[PDB]
Amino acid sequence: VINTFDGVADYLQTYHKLPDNYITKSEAQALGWVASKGNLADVAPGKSIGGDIFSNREGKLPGKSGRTWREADINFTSGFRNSDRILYSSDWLIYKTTDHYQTFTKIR
């Protein structure tokens, strides 16, 4: 449904939550998603992984006290997960990565 950089970025800045097509790693697991089989589409048709907290362990995203980072998958429709992610802060800063959190660029 809404799973592009601009559609999700704009939905988050406005509704302050992810579109309804997103579930967390946990939620997906409970439903039967097995990462190694790339079956998310078979067990949670029309959904994408999103909403989990991203630690920001390598320090690369801007830090502020009180700020927590969250991640969501972009461009997913079926198969194995890709390398595209949206990173959004508690204060609504939006960043993209298309290299599996190696590097990031500001989008909002």
UniProtKB/Swiss-Prot annotation:
One of its GO terms (cellular component) is extracellular region. The active site is at residues 71, 100. Its EC number is 3.1.27.-. The keyword ATP-binding does not apply. It is found in: Secreted. Keywords: Endonuclease, Genetically modified food, Hydrolase, Nuclease, Secreted, Signal. The keyword Transmembrane does not apply. Coiled coil: none annotated. Introduced by genetic manipulation and expressed in male sterile maize and rape by Plant Genetic Systems and in radicchio rosso by Bejo Zaden. Barnase expressed in transgenic plants will specifically destroy the tissue(s) where it is expressed. After cell transformation, protein expression and plant regeneration, the active nuclease destroys the pollen producing organs thus rendering the plant sterile. Hydrolyzes phosphodiester bonds in RNA, poly- and oligoribonucleotides resulting in 3'-nucleoside monophosphates via 2',3'-cyclophosphate intermediates. Belongs to the ribonuclease N1/T1 family. This is Ribonuclease. It comes from Bacillus amyloliquefaciens (Bacillus velezensis). The lineage of its organism: Bacteria, Bacillati, Bacillota, Bacilli, Bacillales.
